[PDB]
Structure formats: structure tokens, C-alpha cells
Amino acid sequence: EPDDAVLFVGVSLVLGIASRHLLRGTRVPYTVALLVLGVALGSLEFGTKHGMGKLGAGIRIWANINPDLLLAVFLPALLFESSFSMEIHQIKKCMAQMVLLAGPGVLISTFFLGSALKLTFPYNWNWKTSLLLGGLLSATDPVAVVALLKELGASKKLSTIIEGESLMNDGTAIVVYQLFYRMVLGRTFDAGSIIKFLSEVSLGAVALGLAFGIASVLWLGFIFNDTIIEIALTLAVSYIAFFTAQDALEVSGVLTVMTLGMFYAAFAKTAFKGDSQQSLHHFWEMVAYIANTLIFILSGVVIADGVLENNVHFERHGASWGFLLLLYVFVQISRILVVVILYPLLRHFGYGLDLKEATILVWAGLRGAVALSLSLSVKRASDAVQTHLKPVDGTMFVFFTGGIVFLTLIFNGSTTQFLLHLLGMDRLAATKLRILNYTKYEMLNKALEAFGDLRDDEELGPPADWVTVKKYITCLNDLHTMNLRDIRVRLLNGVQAAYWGMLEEGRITQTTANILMRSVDEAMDLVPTQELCDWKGLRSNVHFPNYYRFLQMSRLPRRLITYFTVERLESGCYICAAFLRAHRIARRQLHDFLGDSEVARIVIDESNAEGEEARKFLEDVRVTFPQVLRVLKTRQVTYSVLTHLSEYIQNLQKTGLLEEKEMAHLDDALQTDLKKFKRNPPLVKMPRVSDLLNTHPLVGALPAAMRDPLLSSTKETVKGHGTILYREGSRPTGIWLVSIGVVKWTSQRLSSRHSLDPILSHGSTLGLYEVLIGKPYICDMITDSVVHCFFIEAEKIEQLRQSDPSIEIFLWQESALVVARLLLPMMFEKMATHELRVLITERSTMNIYIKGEEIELEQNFIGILLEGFLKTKNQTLITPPGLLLPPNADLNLFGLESSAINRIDYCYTAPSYQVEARARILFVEIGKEHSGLLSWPESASFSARALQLSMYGSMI
Amino acid sequence: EPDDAVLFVGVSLVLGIASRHLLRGTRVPYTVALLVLGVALGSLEFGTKHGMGKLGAGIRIWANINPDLLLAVFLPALLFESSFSMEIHQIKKCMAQMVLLAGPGVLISTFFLGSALKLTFPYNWNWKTSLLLGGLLSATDPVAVVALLKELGASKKLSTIIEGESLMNDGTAIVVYQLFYRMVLGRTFDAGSIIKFLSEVSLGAVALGLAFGIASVLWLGFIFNDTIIEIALTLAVSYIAFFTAQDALEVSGVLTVMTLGMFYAAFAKTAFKGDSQQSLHHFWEMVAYIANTLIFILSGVVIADGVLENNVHFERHGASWGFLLLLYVFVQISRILVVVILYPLLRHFGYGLDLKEATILVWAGLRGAVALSLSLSVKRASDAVQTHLKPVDGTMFVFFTGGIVFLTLIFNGSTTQFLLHLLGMDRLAATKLRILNYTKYEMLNKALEAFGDLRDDEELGPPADWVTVKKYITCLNDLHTMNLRDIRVRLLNGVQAAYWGMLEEGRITQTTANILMRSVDEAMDLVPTQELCDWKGLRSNVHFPNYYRFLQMSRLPRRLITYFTVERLESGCYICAAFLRAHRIARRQLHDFLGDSEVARIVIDESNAEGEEARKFLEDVRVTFPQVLRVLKTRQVTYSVLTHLSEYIQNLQKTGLLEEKEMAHLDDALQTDLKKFKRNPPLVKMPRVSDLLNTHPLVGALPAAMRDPLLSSTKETVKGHGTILYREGSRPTGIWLVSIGVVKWTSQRLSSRHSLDPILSHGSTLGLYEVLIGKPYICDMITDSVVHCFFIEAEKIEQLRQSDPSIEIFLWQESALVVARLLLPMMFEKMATHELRVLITERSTMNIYIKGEEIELEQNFIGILLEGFLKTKNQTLITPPGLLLPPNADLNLFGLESSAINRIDYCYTAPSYQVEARARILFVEIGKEHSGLLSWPESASFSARALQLSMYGSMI
Numbered sequence A, B: 001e002p003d004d005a006v007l008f009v010g011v012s013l014v015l016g017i018a019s020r021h022l023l024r025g026t027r028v029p030y031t032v033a034l035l036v037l038g039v040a041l042g043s044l045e046f047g048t049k050h051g052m053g054k055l056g057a058g059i060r061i062w063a064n065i066n067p068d069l070l071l072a073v074f075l076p077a078l079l080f081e082s083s084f085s086m087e088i089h090q091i092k093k094c095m096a097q098m099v100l101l102a103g104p105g106v107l108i109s110t111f112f113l114g115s116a117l118k119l120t121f122p123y124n125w126n127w128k129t130s131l132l133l134g135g136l137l138s139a140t141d142p143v144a145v146v147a148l149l150k151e152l153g154a155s156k157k158l159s160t161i162i163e164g165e166s167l168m169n170d171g172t173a174i175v176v177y178q179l180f181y182r183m184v185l186g187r188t189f190d191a192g193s194i195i196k197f198l199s200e201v202s203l204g205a206v207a208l209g210l211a212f213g214i215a216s217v218l219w220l221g222f223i224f225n226d227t228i229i230e231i232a233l234t235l236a237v238s239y240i241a242f243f244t245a246q247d248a249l250e251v252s253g254v255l256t257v258m259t260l261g262m263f264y265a266a267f268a269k270t271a272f273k274g275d276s277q278q279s280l281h282h283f284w285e286m287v288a289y290i291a292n293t294l295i296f297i298l299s300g301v302v303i304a305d306g307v308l309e310n311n312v313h314f315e316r317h318g319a320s321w322g323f324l325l326l327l328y329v330f331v332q333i334s335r336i337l338v339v340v341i342l343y344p345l346l347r348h349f350g351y352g353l354d355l356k357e358a359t360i361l362v363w364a365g366l367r368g369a370v371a372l373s374l375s376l377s378v379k380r381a382s383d384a385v386q387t388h389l390k391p392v393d394g395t396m397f398v399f400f401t402g403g404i405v406f407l408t409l410i411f412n413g414s415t416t417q418f419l420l421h422l423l424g425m426d427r428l429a430a431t432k433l434r435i436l437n438y439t440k441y442e443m444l445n446k447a448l449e450a451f452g453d454l455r456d457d458e459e460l461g462p463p464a465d466w467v468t469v470k471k472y473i474t475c476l477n478d479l480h481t482m483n484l485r486d487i488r489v490r491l492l493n494g495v496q497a498a499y500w501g502m503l504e505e506g507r508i509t510q511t512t513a514n515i516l517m518r519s520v521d522e523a524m525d526l527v528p529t530q531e532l533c534d535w536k537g538l539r540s541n542v543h544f545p546n547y548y549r550f551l552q553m554s555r556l557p558r559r560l561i562t563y564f565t566v567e568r569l570e571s572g573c574y575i576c577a578a579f580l581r582a583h584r585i586a587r588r589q590l591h592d593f594l595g596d597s598e599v600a601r602i603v604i605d606e607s608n609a610e611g612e613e614a615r616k617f618l619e620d621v622r623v624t625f626p627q628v629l630r631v632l633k634t635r636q637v638t639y640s641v642l643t644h645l646s647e648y649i650q651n652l653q654k655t656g657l658l659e660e661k662e663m664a665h666l667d668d669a670l671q672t673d674l675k676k677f678k679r680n681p682p683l684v685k686m687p688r689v690s691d692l693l694n695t696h697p698l699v700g701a702l703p704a705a706m707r708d709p710l711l712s713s714t715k716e717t718v719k720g721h722g723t724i725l726y727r728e729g730s731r732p733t734g735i736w737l738v739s740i741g742v743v744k745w746t747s748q749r750l751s752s753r754h755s756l757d758p759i760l761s762h763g764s765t766l767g768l769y770e771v772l773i774g775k776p777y778i779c780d781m782i783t784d785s786v787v788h789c790f791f792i793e794a795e796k797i798e799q800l801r802q803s804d805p806s807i808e809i810f811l812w813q814e815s816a817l818v819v820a821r822l823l824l825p826m827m828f829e830k831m832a833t834h835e836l837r838v839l840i841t842e843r844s845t846m847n848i849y850i851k852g853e854e855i856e857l858e859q860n861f862i863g864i865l866l867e868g869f870l871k872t873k874n875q876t877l878i879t880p881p882g883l884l885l886p887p888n889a890d891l892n893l894f895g896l897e898s899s900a901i902n903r904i905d906y907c908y909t910a911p912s913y914q915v916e917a918r919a920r921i922l923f924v925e926i927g928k929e930h931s932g933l934l935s936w937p938e939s940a941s942f943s944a945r946a947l948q949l950s951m952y953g954s955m956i
């Protein structure tokens, strides 16, 4: 006969499925239908003489479940998913408010509801039974409210508040119930006794949870490439922790399971694989679904059993059916009182709480399966021979808690969306409409591209038209007046597009991307009145390391001192770096889109002024801990490489070109590398002087000979912020090889109207064009941050130009880069180093013309007169720093616009030119994903070795 | 006290984890360590007076498990994963051999081993107990052998044979055990009775399995976007089916669970989501892992309990410890005899079986958890008050089966790799080394590209060198003499690269890709002696539809007649289409790589002769069922679009730009579309005549006016294979607008030396250049398959050219496409329609020169003299079909090589040209993933509307 038990479980699941399939889209949850079906099954089995057969025998086997086994089997499953799948950052920033709703809230609710049950209900309960039942009804449901918020559509702050309030409240309400239930059994009490009991239970639960989490994370760290082992470890450790807490030490078990779930959620990236992240969550969601369905089917059956057994709780008199509604009203009043009493505190702590998101927090008081489990446990413990707990009192408890569980879900849970819509919320911001429409546009473009690519076929013929194929896909079924308000939104849209691109290209993880996107989203609401403010959200993540107090303090192993400083500074450095990249890209895109307009310039100035705090924190990390940034960048590049290789290996397995052994070996190696990286990330040594000089394109690409001379008598120098390298006008006495840092260039005669970032990064050569032409410097360069630089005097460069006829052309190709980034900043500033180097050294043509020849720029060619005096009628003398444009070229398209704001005399538009001295000209030819969000509605050879050294660290 | 039970489970899992973590890499499995730990726990609990506490109490609770509950709980979990995760195509093509090892094999083993136990063992067993124990030892383990093959590295044929033999054998050996066990209880028997029992059990099991599978697939079909529901449905249905079979109808339960698993594996794509495919498998692997660990821990405990209880099976006398080895020898001899008796049959049925892969099939006789479960069930059924089965006999059975389970895994399972290496197998083919090295090269390239892209940073500085970052990633740690043998391998490598590209670009699913890759792999072994033979593997998949007999037969609903014909022809049409695309791409790539060489030409001819069977089956589908190909192509394009949109939506969720409600809606719509497509794929109507004419680029891009004239008096014509459109030399009387089909062009004076496919697909215009120049046709075009074509007489085209000055240039741009695909086939034949159209209509320059002007081809420009008589010294007269090359151009790089094999007189290399009549010239400028596998070691305006109509079905 025990086999029938299995049947029950099976059958229950089926019912669950049905209830979760038909009652979808409708607002009433399916757990109410589950409870009704359970009551029906229990009544059929226990009331009718024939009842059921081979299934009723499986219901009875379950209706007599042990009071302790029930909890030990069903509570860890119910709680581990809710505790494990929760954002740590959000609650950590909101943890102040949740402490007020967890401790004081549960205390107030428990004592009110229980004091009301003692003074009103007629069952002659003493002051322990009533407050026992009051401790039950103070336990929310982390799954019911999770589903409600899934189908609700409220702001994220309120969602996080409710989702945490419920889980933290569940830990506290279970503790109080444990206390009052132990007291109901007969044990005496006292102030000291109550204090010791509460302290022991509460704190030992968390201690055991943290111990088990630490021991099982330390173990998981060494499990390379096997997901079944990790899932089984989580399961076994959760259940062992619950058994050890609730049944070995006599501490709270729900608290231990919650602490374990949270300790796992905090260390998910470090311990579990990246591909086993969606399988783990799905396994635990399946476990939690089974647990809820089984408990809701079981609780109905047990309620029906008790009712039919005693017969004093149904049709005996309307007393019970009225006192149930009275208890519901009391629960509502208790929640209202808790909220109204903690409002003066919940208003200005963590997140705000105005009348709206406080009237929506009082309604979402859904009861779930934890209260039902506790009621079933109490009823089962009473069904035995217990002088203290009578059987009628146990079924009085199974009846009231299940009755309150049904009325709360049908009324509060169904009318939580109607109320949220009535209050005024649930309306799109009208600034997310643009993002939605742009995403729909980008989806339509992807679909069009795929269709167009897959159309040519000689065998299967052509497909149907594009419209006939779009009618099937319903994912695409339906979709200068500029004020200071809209441009501040276009800039934030550009920032969002930059964040999107950075995460897609692998430059930032998904956690950092989510943090930055949340910051931008919370900032796009204050733009209608306040200036651009995106730095608020990240200011709490960019706290200068509190570790710095302790690096000043002495810790014995430098592994600990270097390891912990690179782990408190790791998130802030990445966030400020990404904030300052996204903002620099957004400024450039906005300048390109809205041209030069007074409002666009003011918004750009707002962004420039906003970036100052991040710039200063980055400057402070560079001087206080010099080796942190290099380690962080190396880790970033290594993680990007590993992610790309992982994506490539996963695509190879689908095809079947490689056998099981070889691909299993490939995958094993890749996963071992990924886990060894995420567990003990590598630390990069410091770079030697003579090493940096060899990674610099100019000095690195030179031959072994004629290089010992340049490197000898070259001393690296570390210059601080604001130091002047060379002033404009002074004679050309050097070239400064910037290998680490940034240098900002300023000029008095060069257009600084279209230059939004006059900075030259590492691997650059400053002052070479000027030492080649032998003339005074054309700009005043000043360091922008800490810069490691080398200075080679002019003589050495002259000797090197005199050495080989091919190290004269190399020097010129290397100086043309800086000359073109300086003269024409509107074209050659948005370009990356690789692209500009390719276009200026490979696809650009450097010609030398003898005296007398004629130069006629074809309409498509712009040219920079690198060297030599060129002549033209009425304009005989022309200085070498110079730009030759097509006679009819539109300046406004290249900058150079001669205006009162910026004077331009280094550009020439003439019919033809005639060489006056031996000239050297450079001719260049003229006429990225998600960047359209901003303005959507309106729209070998030395050169190859240098390019290698500039792309990769060393020549390959 | 029941709570302790939970502990046991938990603890067991931990042990499992440990045993599965330490005993990795080593050859001895971990289940033996599991059994040893279980024996240790059982001996500690039952032998010592103190034993254990709060855990031993949980062991006893388990050691007294019900004999039926044990099976009902543990067998479905053990069997559903093995039955569900199995290739259907492989076993279906090998199912002949598995029937011989399943029925006759189990019968022979059972009767031998059981006849030997009766004649040798001294326990005075009767002829039912001995053959009961003999029915146990005939049940293999689908999980032990699965893991063994995972860690073995043998061919795929032997792997599939063993993996199926074990699962099919498990279904048959359980049936026999059920029979003999029911007989041991006391029931009488007879020939008729035995026959009825066997038939009822065996067939009713499969019937119930198929019924449950059908009912649960029909249900799953309507579950849109929820994975938990699908996993819970599989679980609940599996357990309900097992309970209904084993405990309600008295039929075999393992057979029902196996039938259900197979019915699910056959309908995995149609019922389950694409993202819930890795979570379902992982959930069921977790269930199976728990089941194995629990059973192996439980069986050890029960063996120890029985031994310590009776004390006649350990140290009573060496009789037991010797008869155990004797029974092991008997099992080995029984397997050897089965194989030696079925060899004459297993040799030439399905897959072959030579001495090697038959000596490796005799060694892989691992016993697992099914035999242990049956032994535990028998011992438990005996432990009760049973006059038939004594307790000593039950523990004699738990001891022997567990003892045989341990000796088989330690000896056979550990020395199955040593034997496979000794026999000679386990050596790479030396033709997979090239693919492995090329994959390593492509991984290194991806890593280099990612590193180079992620290097420029103004904030975080530069990373370390490339070598310092590659030292961390260990996935990259380590890596004209041409005969008819190697070129036949390069062609197959090109075919493999084409298959890889087609699956990546979404043109074929993963099942078709695996089929084709398996065919190519099995074919690359016969090339050393036999010609190119890839069509063998697919000839069994390309069977002309057996449905055609039934389309001749009358089925009442055309939904059924059209639906079933598009489902028997669906896989063969896709396979032949992909075979003929991959082979056409491989031929082209090989001709490009090895130039014109006698061996390369012979290999190309071999491939051309091999493609004939697929070409003919495709021709037969086009005439017998005309609307099938259009429906298949529309489904292909729609599935590619949906896959691309799904990938795009999954990437959007990671960023957090869109709220929970909007993305949940997007994902819901996408998943609903995907499931409605995979469940009821759409059928495309037939194309109307006046519709096709409007999708043709030339006639479609014309304005509404001057189009009514062309379309009027135009009658579509369907011409069959080999029909002649127009012969070379005849006066130009028409233009044929090919909109569906293919036309092959042949010439007598045009080079057919570098043209590997002279075919023009749909949406092409033939005979327009000739009606424009008013001269005889320049090639003889003949249909290549069934072709739907329209004929507009010459007058109409002349009227249309006279109509507008901009519909003269459009006609010329449209004729230049065919002229350039015809004259210079080495450049303009590998190009897709989109690329060639862009390059010839947008990036190519058509100029008209007046009489007398001079033409000087710049060194980088090739030019086609579309119209007019051009002159040059000593070469006054030059006909318009003509090609002008740079005076120093290398013909061998463009074809045109004047040689005895192919004569060329339409190409001219001269210093300069002088117009003799008003000339019209066209100038073109001169100087893809995984295609390097072959030769790896050695290396608006009318035009825009036409391009739109050619890319997408209609103008957008």
C-alpha cells in the first residue's frame, strides 16, 4: 500500500500544471484553485463512505504526515529559491527599511493580531495559543509576492522593498512562532529565559548558515566543469543545514536556509559556472514549484479531514464563518497599523516612501505556503495525545490560517493591480517609449537582413515575399524645436547606447552593466528640472576604499594586502572607467548630431562638469596604489578573451566536426581556465623600463641595430597631473614617447571648437613633426594624469633619419598621425588607434613633389602639406602645417569654419597649387552598433610592425 | 524519528559528490566506492552495539524500505534519462542488430547462467530461484556504460550499439525477471499461460507508454513560454505511467518508462522549447544521479545488514567467496557465448561487426543499479513471512548481485580502455588532425582579435603584452606534391566548411548539420581507395516518399494529404539541397585553390558525377508535388528570421534598458511565435502569375505607367528540364524573364574552362543585351530544371527604351549583370546576387564616349565594351561583346588564358584605345567564414528598387 503515496504526488503535480495553465493571464492566482482542489479531494476521501480507491489510500498516507518531517522536507525547498534568486546590491542599499518591517513590523503585527484574538474570539484560548496563531499570520510568502510583482509592473524600488520585506519577515515570524510554540508545550519562561532563547535561536541560525555557506563555497571552488555536482552540492548542503539546525542544535532552520541562500547569491559568479547558472535556477524553481503544489494540495486535504472529523467548524454555526472574516479584517488593520506607525521612519531611510508606494505596500500582504506549513505542523502535533494542545484547537488553526491564505490571495492579490493602476502608477514614462520603439526598429532591421541574406537558392527556389513572411512573425506586428530638456535626454540615450556597446563587446560584465543602466534610468527622471545627474547612483559604488585605512595599517602577507585592495577598488574603478568612457562617447555623438548649437554646448558642459568626481577618484587610485589599474585592465582583457573563446567552442560542438574526446578536452581546458580565473584572478607584475620602451610602436618597430643608440641615454620619468611637457613656440629640442597615461594638447591658433577631447593616450609620440621640420612647436602639451614618458633629444632623431632611407618614411608616417589628429580634429578624433593608423599609414598616400610641379586636388581628396613651401597665385608663401581642401569643399562639414568664435588660417581652398620648394604632401580619401539610439527619430614593413606593436603588446 | 531519514539522503549525496570528485580522471568508476561506503555504513550501524546516532536511525528507516515502493520510486528516475537522451536516427539505422542482442541475447544469457547456477551452486535452489537470479544478471546499466563510453573514446558506431544494447536489454531482462519472480511466488504455468503472460506484459507496456506519450505531447504542444511546467509535466507523466503500469494493470513498468522516454526523444523539437532543452536534460541528469547514489548507498547497507543478520555469507566458509568468482566467470562466459552465437548474424546486419568491435562489445558487460534494485526488491519481499522465498535465499541474492556489480565495474569497466587501446583502436585518423589544428588556428585568431580590440583605454591604461595574457589561457597552449588521395580530402574539407557555414548562418538546423557531417566523416575513410562517395550516408535519408503511393491513394482532407507529403519529403529535400549547395561551393573553392591541374579536374568531375542522385530526386519532387519546395523554403526563411530575432531579444535582456513588463511581453510574443511555428508550420499559397511578374526586379522596379504595356500580352510558360530557350546565332527576338527555376548557358566561343556552374537562377533576364545591341545571341541557353518564364517580344523593349531617358540606363544596368557573369566567369560567378548587383550597378561606372575620344585603362580598371565599335592601331575593328584589360595584366589571374584547351579572342591588352563609333563602356575596379579549412596549411533610383525587389520579395 505505500506505493499509492507516489501516485498522490504525481497526481498533485498534474493538477498544479492544469491550474497554472488555465489560470494564466487572469489575475487570480492558481494556488487558490490548488487549495480548492485539495479541499475537494480531502472531503471526497474522508466524508464519503466509498471515497476513492488506490488514490484515497495515498491521500490518507499523506494526511498522517509527521509534524516535523513535513517542515524538514518542505521548508528548505520553499525558501532556498527565494533566498538565492535575489539581488544583493539592491537590498544592501535598501537594507535599512527592511530591518524596520522585519523586526518591529512582525512584532507589532504578532502582538496586535494575537491580542485581538484573545479579546474577541470565543474559543476560550489562553494568551499563548492566541499569540501562537498570531505568529502564524505574520509570515508572508516570498513566492506569491514574487509572482505578483512579476505580473504587477510597478517600479523597481517598490518591487525590491516588497520582495525583501517578505523574505526577511519570513525569517523573523518563524522565529517568533518557534518561541511561542515551544512555550505552548509547557516550558516556563522569564525575561532572562526569553532573551537567551531568542538570542540563541536567531544568532545561531545565522552562524550555522554562514559556516555551511563558507564550507560549501570553498568546496565548489574546486569543481571544474560539472554542473550536476554543483546542483547536488547545493541541494545536499541546504538539506543538511536545515536538519542540523532544526533537529540537532534546536535553532531556527528557516534562518539557516535563508542565510545559506544569501551567501550563495553573494558568491554566484565566484563559485558556480556561467553555463550552469540557468540550470541551477531552473532546478531550484522546479523544486519550489513542486513544494508549493504539494503543500497547497496537502493543506486543503488536511483542512477537509479535520473539519469532517470534528464537525464544529462547518455548519455547526455561522460563528466560524464570521470570525474568519473578522480575523481577515484584523490582519488588514494590523498591516495598516504597522505601516502607519513605521511611516515616519520608512520615509527618509534608504529608498523613499510616499503615500503611493506605501499604500501599495500595505495591500501586498499576501499569505502563502509557510503559514500553511506551520498550521499543518501545529495541527499534526495536536492530533497526537497532547494534554496541552487539544485537537479542536489544531483544526481551529488549520482552518483559520488556510481561510486567511485563500481570502488574502483572492482579494489582495487580484486587486493589487487595479489599485496600482488607480493610484496613478503603471504609466510609461514617455522616455522609455523611445527606447522601446528603437528596439523594435533594430529588430525589424535584423529580420530584414536575415531574410535578404537567406533568399538566393538554386535548389529550393525563392521564398514568399517579405510581407507574407512578416505576417507570421508577430514580434514585429506593431510599433529645429529643441529645448534644454530633450537634449539632456538625448545625451543620456547616448550614454545608454555606449553602455550597451561596452557590455556586448565584452568590456564590462553584466552586473556592472546593470548598475550603470539603473543609474542612468534613475537619472533620466530629474532632467526635466535638474541638470544632468548620473553620478548620484554610482557615488555609493565609488566610495574611496575603506581598505586604504588598513593598507596604512600593517597586514603581514602582501598577497592579502595586494589581494584585498584590488577587491574593494575593483568595482569602483570599473564603474568610473565605464562612466567616463560612456560620457566621452555620448558627448562626441551629441556634438555630431545637433551640430554647434548654444543648448548642445551647455549640455556638453554639464556633462564635463559632472564627470569630475569620477575623474578625481581615478586620479587618486593611480598615485596611492600604482599597480591596481594595470592588474584590472589585464583581468578585463583576459576575461574578454576567455568569453570569446568560450562562445567559439560552444558553436563548434553544435556542428559535429570534432569527436567526443577532442571537444571534451577543449571544453575541459576552457572551463578549467575560466574557473581558475574567476576563483584566483591573476596579478600582473610591474613593467620594467627597458620593457616599455620595446612595446612602444616607434621605438619597438625599429631594427635591433640603430635601436641600442636611441634606448641608451633614455631615462623614464613619471610626471604628475598638470605638468607641462613642451610649450608652443619653443625650439624643437625633443620627442616625448608617452607609453602610459594621457597628454592633453592646447593651442592658441588651432581650432579648439570641434575638439571635445584633446588627449593623446599611451603609445604616442609628441613633438616629432616639429623636430623633423626643424621649427617651433605647434601646440602646448600638458600631462592630463600621471604619465610615464621617455625623452630622446633631437640629435638622435636626426641621426636615425640620416641612417636609412626607410627610417625617414617611417618617422614621417609616425608624425602624420599626431599632425592629422591635431589639424583636423572633427574627422580623426572619434577614430580608434587601429583605424586611424591604418587609414593614415596604409590607405593614405605620401608624395614628394619637386620644385615647379603642379598639384590639383581631385574633388574627393583632402591633403596635409607635411613639409615644404607651396605656392599659389596671390598666396605665394604657405607654411608647412597646412590643410588643402577641394576648391568647392564645404568647410562646415570638416570644421575649419572661419568665424568670430574660432579663427582658421591653416586651411586653403584654391583652384590649383604650384610647388615653390621641394614639397611633401599627404593625401587622404574622403566620401558603431546601437549608436543610433541618441538621434533615432531624425535618422615586414616598419608600418606593419608598428601596427602590430600598437594592437597587441608585442610583435606576433 | 522520521526526520533522520532526510539526513540519510542528504549525507548520501555528499558521499556521492566526494566519490565523483576524487575519482575523476582515474579509470575505476566512483560507484564502486559508493558501494564500499554503503557496506561500511551498514556494517557500522548493524554490527556494532553503539553503531551510530541520529544517522543510524535514518539508515534503519531506509533498510526497511518497501519492496515495491523502492522500484516505483527509483526505476523511472534511473531509466527516463537514459531513454530520453538517445539519438533516434542512429538506433533506427542500427535497430536490426539491437533486436538480436535484446531478445535472443537476454534469453541465452538468462538460460545459460541460470542453468549453470542450478547445476553447480550448493544452496539446493530449485529451477525457478536459480533462473530468477539468472534473470537479474542479464540486466545491464545504461548509465555505467554511458559514462564508460564518455571516457572511452571509441568509434560512434560501436558507441551507439552498446548504448542501445544496454537500454533495450534492460527492457527485456526486466520482463523475464518479472515472469520468473511471479512464478517463484507460487503461480502455476503452461505453454499457453506463459505465452499470454509474456505477450500481455511486453505489449501492454509499450501500448501504455505510447498512449501516455501521445497524450502528454498533445498537451505540451500548447504550453507557450514556461519551462517549469514542461519539466514538471515530464516528471509527473513519467511517474504516473510507471505507477499505472506496474501497480494498476500488472504490466512491465520499465518498458512503459522506456517507451515514454523514446516517444519524448522523438518529439523533442516539436514539443519542448529551444532554451528549455538544456535545463530539462540537466534536471533529469540530476534526478538520475540522485537515484544512482541513493541506490548504491542503499544496496551496500542492505547487503551488510543481511550478511550480519544471517552470518552464513561471510567467514562461514570460503564457499561463498569462491562461488562469487565462479558466478563472475559464468557471466563472462555467457556474454562471450551470446556474442559468438550471434556473430554470423551481427556481422552483416545494420552496422558491421568485425573481430575488434565485437571483442570490445563482449567486454563492456557492466552491471549497474537495475540489477541492484531488483536484488533489493527480492530480498525485501523475502524478509517478510514468505513460505516460498526464504530469508537466506534473499540475502544470497543481495550478496551475489552486488558482488557481481562490484567485480564487473572494477575489472571490465577499468580494463575496457586498456583493451581498446591494445586492440589497435584509439588512434586519430590523421585526417582529423587537420581539422583539430585548423580549429586551434581559428581560436587563436579569435583571441588575437578580441585582445587587439580591447586594448585602447584612456582611464585604466594599457594591458600586459599579448604573450603574458596568452600564458594564462591554456586553451591555446599547444597545437607541388599532390596526389589523387589528398585532393579528395581537400574537397571533403571544403564540403565540411560549407556545412559549418550553412548551419551558422541559419540555413539548416542542427539535426541536418549532424546528419551531413556524419555522412562526410564516414565518407572520408574510403577516399584512399574509392572515389568520392558522400551520397551513401544520405541515400537512406533521401528515399523518394513512400507517401507518394498514398497521395495516389485517396485521403479525404487535403490538409492531411498536403501536410504528410511535406513531412516525409521535408528531410530528404533539405539534405539533397544542402548536399548540392555544399558540393557546388566545394568545387568552386577547390578550383580556386589548386588552379587548373589534371588531378583537381578529375576530382571535380567525380563530385559532379556523384551529385546526380540528389539532383534527380530534387527534379522528381518539382514535377510530382509542385508546391512542396516553396513551402519548405518559406519555412526555412521564417525559422532563420525567428532564430535571429530570438538571439537579439536574449542579448537585450542582459543589459536592462527595457522594464520587466515590456521585455516579458517581447519574449512572450517571440516564444509564442516560435512554438506556433514548430507545432503547426505555415503552408504558403501558390503564386499568382501577375504576382510573379511584379516580384521580378526588371519589371517590378518600373513605374506604374509604361508597365501595363509590358505585362499585357505576357503569358507565363512552364518549361521542363532540357528545353531550349534560344540558340546562339539566331536573331534577337525576345527577353525571357526567369522568375522560378534555373537556366544553364552554353557557348561555342566563350571560355567554359573556369565556369564550374553556368546557371542563372530566378529573378534573371536572359537575352536583353542581345535585343539592345540588335545582334545575334552570344550563348545558347537551355533550362536546367522546371522553369517558369515570361517572354516579352523585342518591340516592347525597344518602345520602353524609347520611352524615358532613365529606362535606357536601367536596361543597360540590368543587361550588364548577365554580360559580366558570362564574359568573366572567374570573378563574377562565386558572387551572390546582392554583391554582384551592388558592384555592377552602384560601384561600377558606365560611360559614353563620343567618336574620336581616347580611352586609357588605369592599371586597376577592367572594362567591358558593352556597346559601340572601338578602334586601336592594327586592331581597327573590335566587336562590342569584349573585355579591355590593363596592357600588362596577367590573364592567368582573370582566366581568358589563350590556350589550346580554350580559345579566347574577346579580351584585349593594348596601350590605348581610340573610339571609332559612339561607345558605351563599363569600368569596374579591381585590387567567407570557415572557408579556409580546405587550403589551410598552404594559407528612389530604379537601381535601388531593383536591388530591393531582388533582396526581399517586394519593395520596402
Ligand SMILES: CCCCCCCCCCCCCC(=O)OC[C@H](COP(=O)(O)OCCN)OC(=O)CCCCCCCCCCCCC
Pocket: A005, A009, A061, A062, A064, A065, A066, A069, A073, A077, A287, A290, A291, B002, B005, B006, B009, B061
Ligand atoms: C521537494 C524536495 C524534497 C526532498 C526530499 C528529501 C528526502 C526525503 C526523505 C523521505 C523520508 C521518508 C519518511 C518516511 O520514512 O516515511 C514515514 C512517514 C510516516 O511516518 P509515521 O507517521 O509512521 O511516523 C511515526 C510517528 N509519526 O511517511 C508518511 O506517512 C508521509 C509520507 C511523507 C513522504 C515524504 C516524501 C518527500 C517528498 C517527495 C517529493 C519529491 C519530489 C521530487
Ligand SMILES: CCCCCCCCCCCCCC(=O)OC[C@H](COP(=O)(O)OCCN)OC(=O)CCCCCCCCCCCCC
Pocket: A002, A005, A006, A009, A061, B005, B009, B061, B062, B064, B065, B066, B069, B073, B077, B287, B290, B291
Ligand atoms: C528521485 C525522484 C524521487 C521522486 C519521489 C516521488 C514521490 C515519493 C513519495 C514518497 C512516498 C513515501 C513512502 C512512505 O509513506 O513511507 C513508508 C515507508 C515504509 O513503509 P512501511 O515499511 O511501513 O510499509 C508497510 C509494509 N512494508 O518509508 C520507509 O520506511 C522508507 C522511506 C522511503 C523514502 C522514499 C522517499 C523518496 C525518495 C526521496 C528522494 C528525492 C530527492 C529529491
